[PDB]
Design a protein around this nucleic acid. Sequence first.
DNA 1: GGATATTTCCCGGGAAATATCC
DNA 2: GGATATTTCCCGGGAAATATCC
Lengths: 105, 116
Amino acid sequence: ELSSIEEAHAYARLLELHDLTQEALAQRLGKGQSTIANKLRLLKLPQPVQEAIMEKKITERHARALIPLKQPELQVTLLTEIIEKSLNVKQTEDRVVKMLEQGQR
Amino acid sequence: TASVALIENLQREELSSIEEAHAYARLLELHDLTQEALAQRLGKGQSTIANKLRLLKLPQPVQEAIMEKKITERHARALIPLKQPELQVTLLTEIIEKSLNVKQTEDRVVKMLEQG
DNA sequence: GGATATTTCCCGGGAAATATCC
DNA sequence: GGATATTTCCCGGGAAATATCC
């Protein structure tokens, strides 16, 4: 078993080296393209977030919930709150939508 | 002492809920420890262990379905409320036939307790 | 049009909360 | 009173549904 970030870093290589479609890799791995794509999106998140995934301090779906907050600053601010308050994914997703509303004011 | 490390590895590696339960039982006979202390040693809760040990009381037909990976733990656990083995095995085959999930298996259970 | 990115939410493990037993 | 049995439901993986891209 490995970190979502490290699993993503792996998939990336395999898709470069074996000239596969995400679908064909997922079929080869026993997953869905959905799963693979979503994990590859994590490689675009801030390094501080990525390090928290590797250190097993946040979950995949925790980090994935931050992406909607397109600004790295807002992602890392919440990251530390999720750690501090020990927030779940459900209330992390809730927190996100409230910040996007505050931003649109 | 040696058999301990074996099961710890058979536990660390993936196994059937029935076989995980059969394992726990032995470990509690071998070190004579409390469910709490084993769970703490394994990194689980006593809750989890106790619930898995309850599966060893379910009908053999149900237990075989767990090992053969035809039903889930929570599928078999949902049958226990139906205290009669006959009613548990009747639903077992329906869950297989209709390919029912746990949510609608739990629902089915309550309806049979109302009927009986 | 196929591949890929994104949104939504179904699903059951498994543990917290609880009741019961010894 | 502690251990153990039982009930309840929290939790996030991960894939279906969907939108978007090339």
